[PDB]
Amino acid sequence: ALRNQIEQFLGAIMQFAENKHEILLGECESNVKLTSTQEHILMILAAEVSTNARIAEQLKISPAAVTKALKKLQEQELIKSSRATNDERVVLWSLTEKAIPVAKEHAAHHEKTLSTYQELGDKFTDEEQKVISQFLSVLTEEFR
Amino acid sequence: ALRNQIEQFLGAIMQFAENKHEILLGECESNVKLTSTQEHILMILAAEVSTNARIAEQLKISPAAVTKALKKLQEQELIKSSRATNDERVVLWSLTEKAIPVAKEHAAHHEKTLSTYQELGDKFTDEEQKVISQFLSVLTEEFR
Ligand SMILES: [Zn+2]
Ligand SMILES: [Zn+2]
Ligand SMILES: [Zn+2]
Ligand SMILES: [Zn+2]
Secondary structure: OHHHHHHHHHHHHHHHOOOOOOOOOOOOOOOOOOOHHHHHHHHHHHHOOOEHHHHHHHHOOOHHHHHHHHHHHHHOOOEEEEOOOOOOOOOEEEEOOOOHHHHHHHHHHHHHHHHHHHHHHHOOOHHHHHHHHHHHHHHHHHHO | OHHHHHHHHHHHHHHHOOOOOOOOOOOOOOOOOOOHHHHHHHHHHHHOOOEHHHHHHHHOOOHHHHHHHHHHHHHOOOEEEEOOOOOOOOOEEEEOOOOHHHHHHHHHHHHHHHHHHHHHHHOOOHHHHHHHHHHHHHHHHHHO
């Protein structure tokens, strides 16, 4: 029965992420029209001023998709270009004042998702959460 | 830490299905060059002779993607067209003798995937599998 439940559970995630890149539980409270990745790019740029290369490394997406998402992001006056004193085809990205609340929302939407996972876990005792933790460790390794 | 582990586990599935539609664990033993969905279409057609509409319902994919996959499937002499005595734009699909071992492989790769899930579950006792089952029930409902 557990074999069929694991197949069912993984199947539900498949349907849920047929067009999404990341899993975010709840609804997006952003007033601006931006995709999952686009809003996340603003989130990582808020904490640290990142280059075109680091965005691809953090998001785990292709640099071709990065330039495609960054061009639509700078179009809506959300991100601004910057270049170092020792240029080695280096393009640093900075966050504008227009993007600051959007990045704040996504960071809150990520902690909102984790808090819902925390609740589901808190239904079980410390010794029960260990059994779940051990399972999710073995299962996650099949997808690595 | 469980909230972070759930976020990590779901993330590993995200990376796994970035180009996949269904989760199959193990390498594909098929000698013919066909995609995940293409080899799954042959599997469902082997047991029951399905119409162009039921394929979209079973696979949970758009009928536009169905015709795109069915045209490449009939090209390699794997599937054959059929029409009823009372035609109401009905296009029934039948499996050829060339496709029979391919559908058999896929069905065995799905049982190979379930058997690996069975193993991971069998590591835990009957009372421990209940704790996991209760968790996966509550978690799967967030993606429904
Ligand atoms: Zn995000
Ligand atoms: Zn958001
Ligand atoms: Zn399949
Ligand atoms: Zn196969």
